Amino acid sequence: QYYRGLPLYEKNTLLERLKQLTPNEIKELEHLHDAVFVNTGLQNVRKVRTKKWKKYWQY
């Protein structure tokens, strides 16, 4: 479903919402999207590093 953190959108319903919003609200949008992207990336690296640390303690 989600691409990275964002869910997938539909062309018809999407092309209306972005027409609704104001240039003062585009900056907030960029920053919310940064937040979600980086949060997903950190989730993934957390998984990987915890596996590697379990193997390190075992060794």
Place this chain on the structure above:
Amino acid sequence: XXXXXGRXXXXXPXXXXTXXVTXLXXXXXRXYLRFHXXXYXXXXXXX
């Protein structure tokens, strides 16, 4: 395609209480001493 009037909105993916939030913009819809210097054999030794 989705770019609107010079804005590059193209690079986007296109395909208890249960509040509802709008997508695309989430909002609600040691050492022990030795004897010396310890004050004996410094007052002593009648030999």
